[PDB]
């Protein structure tokens, strides 16, 4: 870490070049203080990892809306609106999964059950199967663990919600009053199979399993139909430096180096000022981009957004 002198990562020069570019989005400084280390620990998804066995498709001329938003479609599912924070840990491969899973539980058991699945449980109990914890992982294997061992409930940091709420404090940037500084130093907590005190049922009793898991076929229409009847899904794309600068509009890479891979939740689509896009939920807290969400160019496999999408259906009784 660079103690306390010259803070802030990206130059106003990058922010200004993107803005001078006059593209479909506007740049702004999302990060101050943060060490360059932290910014890389944020992109914790390995692209081109293992794929799920299956791959679904749709072969009927479905009539899908011009725009769509799972939050509107499913107003009764509180988790669909929620934005989570991964802290100084590359657990996004796990976040995109538990988030989409929380949504699907509520959707597929249509209304009666709404729970926040533990990203913690996943981050800590999958193991080498999923990759290397806070240093990165693979989305496909996260869903895998859901099918095999399932996941328990667990909300936000210090929320007292669920069996295992996240134990990694929010580093929603910093600046202000020396809040937990965003650092890249952060181990992966251990797989503890015990619910937080003052919470029934028990850990193996509070488990939620998924059926199988699959890939959506790298087709705009296919990815759209899937979300339409099954709910949000997990995806991953290549994060370039300028992306960390997002404020609003439809993001289109214009400059910067590839920071790495990053998994996210895709919950809808639309068109804005003529540019087709995906409505995406990031996991860098709600004081980033457009309240935790952002839009990215759709229909051109931009930065790999359409390349690694996966999901699965939930257990139920």
* 282 among known catalytic residues: yes
Asked about 262 being catalytic, the answer comes back as yes
Annotated catalytic residue, options 92, 125, 195, 303:
92
Residue 8 annotated to the active site: no
Q: Which of 173, 208, 262, 302 is catalytic?
A: 262
Token pair recorded at residue 24? 């479909």
- Catalytic residue (one of 30, 33, 230, 282): 282
CB 225 within 8 A of CB 233: no
Q: Which residues are catalytic?
A: 92, 262, 282
């Amino acid at each position: 870490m660079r103690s306390r002198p010259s803070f802030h990562p990206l130059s106003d020069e990058l922010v200004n070049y993107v803005n001078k570019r006059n593209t479909t989005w506007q740049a702004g400084h999302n990060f101050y203080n943060v060490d360059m280390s932290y910014l890389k620990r944020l992109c914790g998804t390995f692209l081109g990892g293992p794929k799920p066995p299956q791959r679904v498709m749709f072969t009927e001329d479905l009539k899908l809306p011009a725009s769509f938003d799972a939050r509107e479609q499913w107003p009764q599912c509180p988790t669909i609106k929620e934005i989570r924070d991964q802290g100084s840990c590359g657990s996004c491969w796990a976040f995109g999964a538990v988030e989409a899973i929380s949504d699907r539980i509520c959707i597929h058991t249509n209304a009666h059950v709404s729970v926040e699945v533990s990203a913690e449980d996943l981050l800590t109990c999958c193991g080498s199967m999923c990759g290397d914890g806070c240093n990165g992982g693979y989305p496909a294997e996260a869903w895998n663990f859901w099918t095999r061992k399932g996941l328990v409930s667990g909300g936000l940091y210090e929320s007292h919600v669920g069996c295992r709420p996240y134990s990694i404090p929010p580093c929603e940037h910093h600046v202000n009053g020396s809040r937990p500084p965003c650092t890249g130093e952060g181990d992966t907590p251990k797989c503890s199979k015990i619910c937080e005190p003052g919470y029934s049922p028990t850990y193996k009793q509070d488990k939620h399993y998924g059926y199988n898991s699959y890939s959506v076929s790298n087709s705009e229409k296919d990815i759209m139909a899937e979300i339409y009847k099954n709910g949000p899904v997990e995806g991953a794309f290549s994060v370039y430096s300028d992306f960390l600068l997002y404020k609003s509009g439809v993001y289109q890479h214009v400059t910067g180096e590839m920071m790495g891979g990053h998994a996210i939740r895709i919950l809808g689509w639309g068109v804005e000022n003529g540019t087709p896009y995906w409505l995406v939920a990031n996991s860098w807290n709600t004081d980033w981009g457009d309240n935790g969400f952002f839009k990215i160019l759709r229909g051109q496999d931009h930065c790999g957004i359409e390349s690694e999408v996966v999901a699965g259906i939930p257990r139920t009784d």
